[PDB]
């Protein structure tokens, strides 16, 4: 139909994160059978491949940004080949790989759509700048590049000339947050970014977070929606083969509720399935649970609802 | 028909693992699930472990929870199986067949209908 | 770890009658097992699916019965290509045993 028509694009990318090997994420989110546990459903699955991901051997650091230019280089890759497969009219399912990407995941999703809303499921805000990380890895900053109201304030930090922030202050919501240094806070009040964290994830209960999230993006009209989920968002008893867990994340039944509440508008329109990382289970088993709660994260997205899926025939039959 | 095509005659030391190859074709896959059972000569034989294909369940044995890692290809019908810590017990046939998945959609199955034609793997150093 | 015992370890009956071969268990595994044809160095083939029934490329011969402690596995029209180290298997309990071991030789 409109939705479940998905466009699969694997990024293995790491250089925004430090922790080399995300760049087995979609490997092994393919080989746990992301594109057939979708085929049940009607979802019209076109692979586009991976994309490449050139290697700049001196892409030389910024004064805290480390890495900045292949970051750059595969975010507007990623911008182009989402703008692509956003002009083949499916739902973009971008899976890497690393935050770093989201930049050209939004971007190019906005190429399309320029009133889109973002919720940026994760356990970090991740919108530290160039000049006010402590880090400088861009794995947590693409929300920074993205927002207008950032504008004159992000350095020309190379690789980001085609950057072209897009979204609006007013059109992001947070789901999720438990961990945040003080420079990404300080945006997060000063711009009033609605958000519920996981304060006010338990305190409306999360059916009623979505529900004012909903009511926040949607009640003032229907909009296409980006759901960029980073899966250290949930608990690391579910996912603790991910790049930075941090304990307190939500529960994997309501991660699963968020994916299907995004569904049941009928507006998903764009998806990402980042930081996940085969090798930072301690066991194997770590890593099984860890990749098979994002495939069911991103099943439950495009809606294998758990309520049930159906083909429109008769079964008494 | 329905088989399965295994690969391959490996020896390790006490080293890394073999990732036993085992292709299917024929029958429709995730639609049943593929399992493990070594044998070594002259003894009789150990089911090691089951997955269904159907949704990632891993459901290894005893004495080795631990040892085996068993995962699923399914874009092309083979499944897989390593170990670890290798030893010179394991100096063993490995065998993949076909238990069925015991999941919600897939039929009933208790009976081991591919067999490959297994994978001469001893540990000796 | 259920022992499944093959009370005819060895065999050797010539090319003509019946060749009912013995399984027992040790709890019950109520019609949940399954029987084999290794021949030397090959792929141990499923010869009877679920203690009955006949699996998908059988030939004509291949009757067997259970339900469900101690089964039977009967080769009524010999057939001397048939001559393999026989295998059941019990399945429906973890972890999953096997049998002993029924070479069926040629008798001469």
């Known amino acids: 139909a409109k939705s479940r028509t998905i466009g699969i694009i694997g990024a293995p990318f790491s250089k925004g994160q430090p922790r080399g090997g995300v760049e087995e994420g979609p490997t092994v989110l393919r080989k746990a059978g992301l594109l057939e546990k979708l085929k049940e459903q009607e979802c019209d699955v076109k692979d586009y491949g991976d994309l490449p991901f050139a290697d700049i051997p001196n892409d030389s650091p910024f004064q805290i940004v480390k890495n900045p230019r292949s970051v750059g280089k595969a975010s507007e890759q990623l911008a182009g080949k989402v703008a692509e497969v956003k002009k083949n009219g499916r739902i973009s399912l971008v899976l890497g790989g690393d935050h770093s990407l989201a930049i050209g995941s939004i971007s190019g999703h906005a190429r399309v759509h320029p009133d889109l809303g973002v919720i940026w499921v994760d356990a970090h805000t991740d919108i530290n700048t160039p000049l006010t990380t402590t880090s400088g890895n861009l794995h947590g900053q693409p929300v920074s590049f993205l927002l207008k109201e950032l504008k004159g304030k992000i350095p020309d930090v190379p690789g980001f000339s085609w950057v072209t922030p897009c979204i609006s202050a007013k059109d992001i919501v947070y789901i999720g947050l438990r961990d945040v240094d003080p420079g990404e806070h300080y945006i997060l009040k000063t711009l009033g970014i609605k958000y519920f964290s996981m304060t006010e994830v338990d305190r409306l209960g999360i059916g009623k977070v979505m529900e004012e999230t909903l009511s926040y993006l949607l009640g003032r009209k229907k909009r296409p929606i980006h759901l960029s989920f980073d899966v250290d968002g949930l608990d690391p008893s579910f996912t603790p083969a991910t790049g930075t867990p941090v304990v307190g994340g939500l529960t994997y039944r309501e991660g699963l509720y968020i994916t299907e509440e995004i569904y049941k508008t009928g507006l998903l329109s764009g998806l990402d399935i980042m930081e996940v990382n085969p090798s930072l289970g301690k066991t194997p088993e770590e890593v099984t649970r860890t990749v098979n709660t994002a495939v069911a994260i991103t099943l439950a997205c495009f809606g294998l609802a758990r309520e049930g899926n159906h083909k429109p025939i008769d079964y008494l039959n | 028909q329905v088989q399965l095509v295994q690969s391959g005659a490996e020896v390790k030391k006490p080293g890394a693992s073999v990732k036993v190859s085992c292709k299917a074709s024929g029958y429709t896959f995730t639609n049943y699930g593929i399992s493990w059972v070594r044998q070594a000569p002259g003894q009789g034989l150990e089911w090691m472990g089951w997955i269904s294909a159907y949704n990632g369940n891993t459901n290894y044995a005893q004495k080795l929870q631990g040892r085996v890692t068993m995962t699923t290809d399914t874009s092309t019908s083979t499944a897989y199986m390593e170990l670890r810590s290798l030893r010179s017990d394991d100096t063993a046939v490995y065998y993949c067949?076909?238990?069925?998945?015991?999941?919600?959609?897939?039929?009933?199955?208790?009976?081991?209908?591919?067999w490959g034609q297994g994978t001469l793997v001893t540990v000796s150093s | 770890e259920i022992v499944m015992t093959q009370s005819p370890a060895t065999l050797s009956l010539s090319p003509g009658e019946r060749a009912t071969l013995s399984c027992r268990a040790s709890?019950?595994?109520?019609?949940?097992l399954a029987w084999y044809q290794q021949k030397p160095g090959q792929a141990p083939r499923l010869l009877i699916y679920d203690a009955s029934n006949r699996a998908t490329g059988i030939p004509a011969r291949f009757s067997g019965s259970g339900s469900g402690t101690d089964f039977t596995l009967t080769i009524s029209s010999l057939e001397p290509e048939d001559f393999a180290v026989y295998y059941c298997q019990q399945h429906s309990l973890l972890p999953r045993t096997f049998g002993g071991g029924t070479k069926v030789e040629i008798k001469r």
């Open positions: 067949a076909r238990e069925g998945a015991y999941g919600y959609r897939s039929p009933y199955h208790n009976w081991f209908d591919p």
């Open positions: 709890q019950s595994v109520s019609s949940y």
